[PDB]
Amino acid sequence: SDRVAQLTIGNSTITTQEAANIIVGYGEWPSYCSDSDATAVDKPTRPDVSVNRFYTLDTKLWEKSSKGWYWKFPDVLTETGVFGQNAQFHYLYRSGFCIHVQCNASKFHQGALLVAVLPEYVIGTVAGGTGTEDTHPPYKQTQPGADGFELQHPYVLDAGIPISQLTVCPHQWINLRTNNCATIIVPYINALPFDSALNHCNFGLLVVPISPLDYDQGATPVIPITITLAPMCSEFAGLRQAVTQ
Amino acid sequence: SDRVAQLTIGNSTITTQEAANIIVGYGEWPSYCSDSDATAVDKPTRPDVSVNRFYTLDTKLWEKSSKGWYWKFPDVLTETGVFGQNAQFHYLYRSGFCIHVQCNASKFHQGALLVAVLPEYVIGTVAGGTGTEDTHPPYKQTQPGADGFELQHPYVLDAGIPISQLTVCPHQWINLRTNNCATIIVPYINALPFDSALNHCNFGLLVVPISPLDYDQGATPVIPITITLAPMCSEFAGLRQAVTQ
Amino acid sequence: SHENSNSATEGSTINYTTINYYKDSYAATAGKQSLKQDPDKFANPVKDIFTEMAAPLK
Amino acid sequence: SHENSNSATEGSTINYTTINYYKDSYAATAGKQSLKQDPDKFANPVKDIFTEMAAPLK
Amino acid sequence: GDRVADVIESSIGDSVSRALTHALPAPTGQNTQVSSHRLDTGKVPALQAAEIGASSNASDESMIETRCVLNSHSTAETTLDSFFSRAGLVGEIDLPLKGTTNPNGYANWDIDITGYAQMRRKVELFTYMRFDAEFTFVACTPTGEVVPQLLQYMFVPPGAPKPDSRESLAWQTATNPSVFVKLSDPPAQVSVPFMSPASAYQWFYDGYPTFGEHKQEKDLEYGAMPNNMMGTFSVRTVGTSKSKYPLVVRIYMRMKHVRAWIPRPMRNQNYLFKANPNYAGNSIKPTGASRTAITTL
Amino acid sequence: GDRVADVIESSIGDSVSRALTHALPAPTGQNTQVSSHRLDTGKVPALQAA
Ligand SMILES: CCCCCCCCCCCCC/C=C\[C@H](O)[C@H](N)CO
Ligand SMILES: [K+]
């Protein structure tokens, strides 16, 4: 009754029989922008069911040596479905998200993933190693799209900050002996009421193994991690031609 | 609370800790024959506890290659206990049945049996193979007694009808990862108020593997299927000498 | 009318509107049947019913 | 009578007086239609109507 | 009178059929209600346990977001009378001039509707059926020509004498019902009541009609239900001299005032013999069509 | 105006931030209450699910 769950939005339904409750980021559900917080004057478009629905975007393989990955929002979805089209045809965008990370193994496998959402996840570089070069991360690294990107130095989250404190952010753990998914609801987080879905990623999703995957030889060795997410309360404004960058 | 169950009737009690509810065939409990449906005028005899009780009649071994079996009612019981004696000494008989099919394995075994009750289960023959011979099934095949009989062509139920639609009949499944028994309550089904227990079988019980039994070498390979049943609301009339056929 | 109750459906929980010109009711038209249905008899004949929201096996 | 509502015109803003001897209404005669007409739907479907006396384009 | 407590608190003799379900009116298809998103733990309509034996109780509304749809689609055409009260061929009788079969101007047909597949497959969807029937008799020559010939049809219930010639005394028909009709007249047509000694006819009877040893010689009686044996339909040309014309009588049956009990799987193999489910063991076919792989259409 | 049921029962446009939590005054550290021994089944504050 805390372990079983069904999430239905749009024409999509997710089920899980080994859940660990649901986290509502910063204790606040997503909502549409009020007339007093808004500034842009055109009437927005709110497509509803055709964009607020679950999209399964990618699968990674968890290996005994995996470092961890990240995805950026709304970047992961800007080229997918009717949501993508709207994000491309409109200058302004805003929405919340329901994130459902999936990973099942067996009662004989073990390991624990930390699944967290970090708003304004700015990536740093190793500065030429010596720390004397002011190098910058390239586009494919700051906005990896649906493929996500692998962390080079998980301990400092590729940004000079301790992953040990990442739990100060909305998160759940997928500890194999306990659950097989993480569900996080994130409201729209920004210092502006609407923004560009292309130029700005409001938050990053981090999936990092903290207790490494293990099992005895002979047990299924391919343990996938699949990412499914749904935009909530999407609004778009400032219509013109479609743009991808 | 849907999984645990105790069935007590007569001097017999059955327990199960991995049940899947109880099916009451055609949504109707067994009952005695009313004075308006009845036609025979002699006062019936209703032995009660000595005949309405559980009888464990047979055990079959489920093998990776098993085809399936059937038993006919009340044939299975006409030679057992006080019930048998009454069925033999009386021309008329009627009763309902509580059927409990048993099969336990381990959390590492797998497979699924379909347990169904098919009223008026007329057996057909392969008609000499070519279909040109009007051959008929012999007595040992139409009324196999407590031993039951193995199906030759389960797909057409040895009667030219699809087992894929057998679920239109009162049934349960014994899917090893879920339960270890099936319980079906059947009311008296006939177009007459009473009938001969010897000349007519009101229904057949079918136990057919649909998802074959499997397990790794080293796990207990002997997986029995035991049939236990209890007549309910038995009534007998038209008394004379004992007859077996 | 004033016929015999010869029809195969006399005493049926469903009532019909038929036409007839003979003293025996089985001579009547098929007419119209009432539109009642009980699918649970076949689709859900469980002793203890379970709701849609709950987990069937608890 | 007590038939089925099988006719192709059940729910028509115009009512008919037909004859029938069968349980299905589509078996009925054509009967009489009511004599209502709306020519403006085709002859004058303008958003802002103009009168006969005025100059159409003012 | 009964003094011991167990006799007093006994349910022996309870003749009331306790029913777990009940019929509700349902003249149209069910409507669809508006539904929205649900992101909740504990509640899970999509998950089931087919082992229980019930069908899924999940609906459109709980699996996707639905709009409101007011459904006026009628359920009237799927009542048993709608399905069965349509006349189909159930018998064919030949009265030829020269021949091996019925060559003497008369024929006796035991009433059995299992000789024709369309009709037989429909009625066998159920185990028990109770109904009245309308029988229509279409007669003509083998080319479909209409000739000026008078016929006599007689219903011969079990125990009544079956005619053995076109001149049998049995044709006096003083008690049996007979229909005298010309081939030139429209098809003869009559209403027949529900006649079984039982409460219903049954297309399947898993038993024997008599007691005794069931030796292989008398295994042709397995499944033989005398309760479905309504008698003989006899026909003759009305004369002491042979008819000038070869004739064919087609028999159509239309059920009405139908009740049925116990649905069963529908026939998936060709029928071989009347009133018996034998199928060709060398030609067992899949119920439907096949394809080469489970991953392509 | 809106006639189809789904438009009427729609939550599209809800601008109220529904909050699961709320701030309470807390000018000092929380006090400690007297507690005694508890030897009970079912109740288990020490066990968690991080
Ligand atoms: C003057 C003409 C009268 C014709 C009389 C026709 C009476 C027919 C009674 C309907 C019988 C229904 C069919 C019954 C049983 C099946 O055919 C088979 N015996 C089943 O094994
Ligand atoms: K409706």
Ligand code: NA
């Ligand atoms: Na459910």
Ligand code: NA
């Ligand atoms: Na606790």
